[model samples]
Target chain A: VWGVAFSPDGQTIASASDDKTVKLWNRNGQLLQTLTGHSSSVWGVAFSPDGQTIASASDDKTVKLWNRNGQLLQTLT
Target chain B: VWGVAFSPDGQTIASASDDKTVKLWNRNGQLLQTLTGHSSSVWGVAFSPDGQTIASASDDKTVKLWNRNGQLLQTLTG
Candidate 1:
């Protein structure tokens, strides 16, 4: 894992990896989702203060935002 | 080019970069410190809850501990 972060609720973990993806998991270690849009290694993942959105930084030189359901919200280059 | 974190007090930003360094910045974007030592790209950085220490994870396969002044305190390996 290149980076990991806990959701504000403490129930989920978001892990960024060199595999070019971000995986979301519950406290029980069950994989909730795999975020796969980044073309290069995902280097960082962070949750919004309110836990409403997730921001992932990638070597692709873009920051991608996703909603709780894993829906792409925006891309910031 | 890897990880980023905010201090518990929300006063500083720590950025781990491919340049093999972790940089500390204030809210105003003023550069505070450039933490060096790792010989490889720094992949992660985090501040302790009490805001007294910093832990940096690098591709060098080690986690380094540093004080607020960027002084190396310890090296942890798995």
Candidate 2:
């Protein structure tokens, strides 16, 4: 099961999937974009305290940080 | 807000409350039981896969495990 979350501001919902992709959804549950590039299933996700960014952990042995708009903001191994 | 848990087998749900009680619910959200004793708020809850037990974490600084029917099964803290 992938991890899904709401941004701290509650404007977006993010999902980390086994397909190695993270998806961003609008509050209406509409899929707005897919953020891909991880090597394995993404299993956990949490928004930063201020909600400007999202952090995801993956079985790929990496943790990635992304902007609310689905851009790759940073990558941490 | 207290923590609410749905049993893995989908047979029941347990809610940990600030009233110092853990409440049980069926799938339809009907209240079934109330297990009280904690001295503070209950904040988290998880159920065993078999649906026979519940584990709850609370601001009371204690974790209690309970039977499906609301009986206290165990308490672990240090």
Candidate 3:
């Protein structure tokens, strides 16, 4: 994993992996969301302080923001 | 900034920036370390739960592991 953060609620984790994906998991380590879109490895991941949004940066040279449920919100090149 | 994470002890913060560096900050928001080595933008940064190691990935296509004091521990590529 390249980036790791626990949600503001501290009950789940959002992590970026070299495998080119972002994964969300509960505190118990149960996988919840597998966010895929970047054509290359995801290098960073963060959750908004309010826990409403997620941001990820990739080797693809793009940064993407998403809603907590895994819906794409925006992408910045 | 691209990535953000606080030290495991929850006192300082370690974050990656587009500026090609990683910064470690103490609880008072004072800079503790300026980790410079990546030749390009640093894309990600994180701390090991044990509080002794940090990993940063970069536009340089390599992942770097470091000791808390900003010393390079190893570079990974393959």
| Candidate 3 lDDT tens digits, A1-71 | 23666566655567675579887766443677878899997767788878889999888999999998889
Ranking of candidates on lDDT, top first? 1, 3, 2
The candidate scoring highest on lDDT is 1
Ranking by DockQ: 1, 3, 2
Residue by residue across B1-78, what tens digits does model 1's lDDT show?
Answer: 537776766556677755788877664446778898999988778889887799999888999999988799999999
TM-score of chain A of each: 0.93, 0.85, 0.92
Compared with the true structure, model 2 gives a TM-score of 0.50
Give the CA lDDT, 0 to 100, for residue A16 in model 2. Answer: 72
Q: How close to the true structure is residue B56 of candidate 2, measured as C-alpha lDDT?
A: 81
TM-score of 1: 0.54
Query: For residues B1-46, could you state the per-residue lDDT of candidate 2 as single tens digits?
Result: 2255555544465655547777776644367888887888787778
Question: Tens digits of per-residue lDDT for model 1 on A1-77?
Answer: 13788998999999986689898999998999888899988877888667767777787856677877888876554
Q: How big a share of the true inter-chain contacts is recovered in candidate 3? A: 0.08
Each candidate: fraction of true contacts kept? Answer: 0.06, 0.00, 0.08
Looking at candidate 2 chain A, the ten consecutive residues that score lowest on lDDT are: A55-64
